[PDB]
Design an enzyme around this catalytic site. Sequence first.
Site, PDB file in Angstrom:
ATOM      1  N   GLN A 104       4.381 -11.169  -5.199  1.00 36.89           N
ATOM      2  CA  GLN A 104       5.145 -10.427  -4.529  1.00 36.89           C
ATOM      3  C   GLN A 104       5.697 -11.102  -3.410  1.00 36.89           C
ATOM      4  O   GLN A 104       6.499 -10.378  -2.548  1.00 36.89           O
ATOM      5  CB  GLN A 104       4.525  -8.978  -4.200  1.00 36.89           C
ATOM      6  N   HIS A 124       9.727 -10.110  -5.942  1.00 36.44           N
ATOM      7  CA  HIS A 124      10.540  -9.505  -4.648  1.00 36.44           C
ATOM      8  C   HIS A 124      11.500 -10.382  -4.424  1.00 36.44           C
ATOM      9  O   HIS A 124      12.210  -9.965  -3.104  1.00 36.44           O
ATOM     10  CB  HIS A 124       9.346  -9.267  -3.641  1.00 36.44           C
TER      11      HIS A 124
HETATM   12  N1  LIG Z   1      -6.591 -13.538   5.300  1.00 37.22           N
HETATM   13  C1  LIG Z   1      -6.591 -12.714   4.368  1.00 37.22           C
HETATM   14  N2  LIG Z   1      -7.558 -12.535   3.301  1.00 37.22           N
HETATM   15  C2  LIG Z   1      -7.744 -11.570   2.562  1.00 37.22           C
HETATM   16  N3  LIG Z   1      -6.992 -10.470   2.883  1.00 37.22           N
HETATM   17  C3  LIG Z   1      -5.942 -10.431   3.603  1.00 37.22           C
HETATM   18  C4  LIG Z   1      -5.769 -11.570   4.337  1.00 37.22           C
HETATM   19  N4  LIG Z   1      -4.715 -11.249   5.256  1.00 37.22           N
HETATM   20  C5  LIG Z   1      -4.173 -10.060   5.014  1.00 37.22           C
HETATM   21  N5  LIG Z   1      -4.967  -9.458   3.966  1.00 37.22           N
HETATM   22  C6  LIG Z   1      -4.755  -8.281   3.152  1.00 37.22           C
HETATM   23  O1  LIG Z   1      -3.751  -8.529   2.517  1.00 37.22           O
HETATM   24  C7  LIG Z   1      -2.961  -7.330   2.191  1.00 37.22           C
HETATM   25  C8  LIG Z   1      -1.574  -7.462   2.258  1.00 37.22           C
HETATM   26  O2  LIG Z   1      -1.077  -6.312   1.493  1.00 37.22           O
HETATM   27  P1  LIG Z   1       0.338  -5.639   2.109  1.00 37.22           P
HETATM   28  O3  LIG Z   1       0.691  -6.116   3.471  1.00 37.22           O
HETATM   29  O4  LIG Z   1       0.554  -4.336   1.747  1.00 37.22           O
HETATM   30  O5  LIG Z   1       1.367  -6.767   1.241  1.00 37.22           O
HETATM   31  P2  LIG Z   1       1.896  -6.814  -0.411  1.00 37.22           P
HETATM   32  O6  LIG Z   1       2.131  -8.111  -0.634  1.00 37.22           O
HETATM   33  O7  LIG Z   1       0.797  -6.230  -1.044  1.00 37.22           O
HETATM   34  O8  LIG Z   1       3.037  -5.691  -0.066  1.00 37.22           O
HETATM   35  C9  LIG Z   1       3.815  -5.701  -1.090  1.00 37.22           C
HETATM   36  C10 LIG Z   1       5.178  -5.583  -0.621  1.00 37.22           C
HETATM   37  O9  LIG Z   1       5.301  -4.444   0.042  1.00 37.22           O
HETATM   38  C11 LIG Z   1       6.123  -4.593   1.077  1.00 37.22           C
HETATM   39  O10 LIG Z   1       7.406  -3.580   1.221  1.00 37.22           O
HETATM   40  C12 LIG Z   1       6.999  -6.097   0.439  1.00 37.22           C
HETATM   41  O11 LIG Z   1       7.964  -5.940  -0.209  1.00 37.22           O
HETATM   42  C13 LIG Z   1       5.762  -6.579  -0.343  1.00 37.22           C
HETATM   43  O12 LIG Z   1       6.377  -7.563  -1.158  1.00 37.22           O
HETATM   44  C14 LIG Z   1      -3.523  -6.229   3.071  1.00 37.22           C
HETATM   45  O13 LIG Z   1      -4.380  -5.242   2.465  1.00 37.22           O
HETATM   46  C15 LIG Z   1      -4.607  -7.164   4.029  1.00 37.22           C
HETATM   47  O14 LIG Z   1      -5.732  -6.576   4.283  1.00 37.22           O
END
Ligand SMILES: Nc1ncnc2c1ncn2[C@@H]1O[C@H](COP(=O)(O)OP(=O)(O)OC[C@H]2O[C@H](O)[C@H](O)[C@@H]2O)[C@@H](O)[C@H]1O
Length: 282
Positions: A104, A124
């Site tokens: 994504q 994305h």
């Molecule tokens: N170091 C880490 N280790 C593990 N988990 C982590 C860390 N840092 C962050 N997290 C987790 O990483 C997760 C990140 O989730 P999100 O932030 O929803 O990003 P997406 O890639 O799913 O968002 C998808 C789309 O939505 C948007 O609109 C954009 O269009 C994106 O493309 C969180 O739950 C954190 O706890």
Amino acid sequence: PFTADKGKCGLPEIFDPPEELERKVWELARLVWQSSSVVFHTGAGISTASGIPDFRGPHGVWTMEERGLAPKFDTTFESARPTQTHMALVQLERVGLLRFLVSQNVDGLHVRSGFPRDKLAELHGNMFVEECAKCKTQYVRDTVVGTMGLKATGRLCTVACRGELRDTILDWEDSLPDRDLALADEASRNADLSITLGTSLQIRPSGNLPLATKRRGGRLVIVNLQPTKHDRHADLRIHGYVDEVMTRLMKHLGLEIPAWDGPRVLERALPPLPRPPTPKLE
Ligand SMILES: Nc1ncnc2c1ncn2[C@@H]1O[C@H](COP(=O)(O)OP(=O)(O)OC[C@H]2O[C@H](O)[C@H](O)[C@@H]2O)[C@@H](O)[C@H]1O
Ligand SMILES: Cc1cc(F)c(Br)cc1NS(=O)(=O)c1ccc(NS(=O)(=O)c2cc(Cl)cc(Cl)c2)cc1C(=O)O
Ligand SMILES: [Zn+2]
């Protein structure tokens, strides 16, 4: 756009205690060794450790918005290095352990890490990638393409064409690229193991792809500090930093994490390198 549903932001982080953490990473090792076709799904949580904020984490872009606060970058997109996790996925693909990579992320770090573009779906889009509206030729630039939402960038196609270049960054309303989605779906459907790293899995259809692996008896592993939309469907859930999980995993698999030479693009996957032989498991 203003109206956009940005889903659940700022949910509490979960920390598996180190003994449970060690057992879960070992079980992930075992799942990788057993699986014929392994697919990785990545989100904004794999780049936090490079200075790039996530969306729905505690200090995520959308989370901070909700609170009237700004997110914090510790790097520019141009100056960001791939994390240990990024480089570990480069290695797993080189040794034939990773079949496909679904992302994504728009931060461009998978391509810049040297990950082969023919084994990657960028659902994305990519801030460094612009596409010719006429001939669909894509250019991977060294600096971010200055527009989002599939806008004219102000450059023209140079194919053996003079098409209008546009950015590949989807706006909320925009349907996902058919080719990246088609290949992402095929890969997810036929995998016997889908591993999620640092995505909350709240976006359709992006977050739903790993669940397709569960049809015909495939296993799903979710690695994520926060709860995710499909936690109940996971065979294994690991609550820990992805860098810590993947470094422990690489050591189990007997793989080194490779050196990043700097920003490089690899269109096609290279022939598979040797890998350690498999443990006796049962
Ligand atoms: N170091 C880490 N280790 C593990 N988990 C982590 C860390 N840092 C962050 N997290 C987790 O990483 C997760 C990140 O989730 P999100 O932030 O929803 O990003 P997406 O890639 O799913 O968002 C998808 C789309 O939505 C948007 O609109 C954009 O269009 C994106 O493309 C969180 O739950 C954190 O706890
Ligand atoms: C582009 C980007 C990539 C990432 F990986 C991460 Br993390 C963050 C960002 N951008 S951000 O800082 O956090 C960021 C997030 C959202 C928006 N708004 S928007 O959807 O494009 C938009 C605005 C308007 Cl007025 C109309 C429409 Cl139709 C759409 C801008 C930025 C930015 O660049 O200022
Ligand atoms: Zn063109």
